[PDB]
Symmetry: C2
Subunit: 146 residues, 2 copies
């Protein structure tokens, strides 16, 4: 009392509320208009790190060529990325950020960093043995929502 | 590896996906069209148990008279509840289910029962000491989403 079952129920309620109208669960971020899909945001983060081919994007983000094609089309339309030709091979297209996209990618990277660091700091309050309990709990609970 | 931080991130992703387009996190329920708000569903559950006044509904569900008034209006329009006059006092209105609502309330009650029992069975796999760890974890994580 409160029972753990009820605590779990209430926790999931909290998460549902926070998640409403969002593409991703991210902390330290102000409410705003959803401009880009998560895949689009993640392509921009990848390109901030390395100019990349369609193939490399699919590989890194673990998504299909169709998904990559769709996201790139939208990003290019919004003038957030630009294509170029690989000097080694005339057939190979590379993608890079436009200046417009630089702060967009930086902002999204920051949101992920803040979110992960928040979870890390929380986890750091628990010993390995306790983290194992939490991990087993999360794994089991995850199975219920498949 | 996977780090607990990453496990938490992925877990919350799973929950976000499950929660999309839903009023409540409920298990053992098939996908369907959202006909009623959660408050409306909960009034029906309450009335299945006891014919009740507006005041009693607000008390039991811990919501305001305005919230109760709004939900009752919609339920009555859908012919899911009906008013009657308390025999003791001509001024006191009581609400009861219509036959139409009986299976609706039963179904929603079942969903809550299934959901809670699922969490209970999961919790039952952990000792009290382990449940305390989980509880502390959930409490702390909840604070991040306020
Ligand atoms: Zn993201
Ligand atoms: Zn409910």
């Amino acid at each position: 009392g409160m029972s753990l079952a009820n605590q779990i129920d209430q926790f999931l309620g909290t998460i549902m509320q926070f998640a409403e109208n969002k593409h991703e669960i991210l902390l330290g971020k102000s409410e705003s208009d959803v401009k880009l899909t998560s895949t689009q945001e993640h392509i921009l983060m990848l390109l901030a790190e390395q100019i990349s081919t369609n193939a490399k994007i699919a590989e890194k983000l673990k998504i299909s060529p169709a998904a990559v094609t769709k996201a790139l089309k939208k990003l290019q339309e919004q003038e957030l990325i630009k294509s170029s030709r690989a000097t080694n091979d005339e057939r190979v297209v590379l993608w890079s950020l436009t200046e417009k996209a630089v702060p967009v990618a930086k902002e999204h990277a920051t949101h992920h960093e803040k979110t992960l660091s928040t979870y890390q700091e929380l986890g750091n309050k628990f010993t390995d043995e306790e983290q194992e309990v939490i991990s087993k709990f999360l794994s089991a609970l995850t199975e219920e929502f498949q």
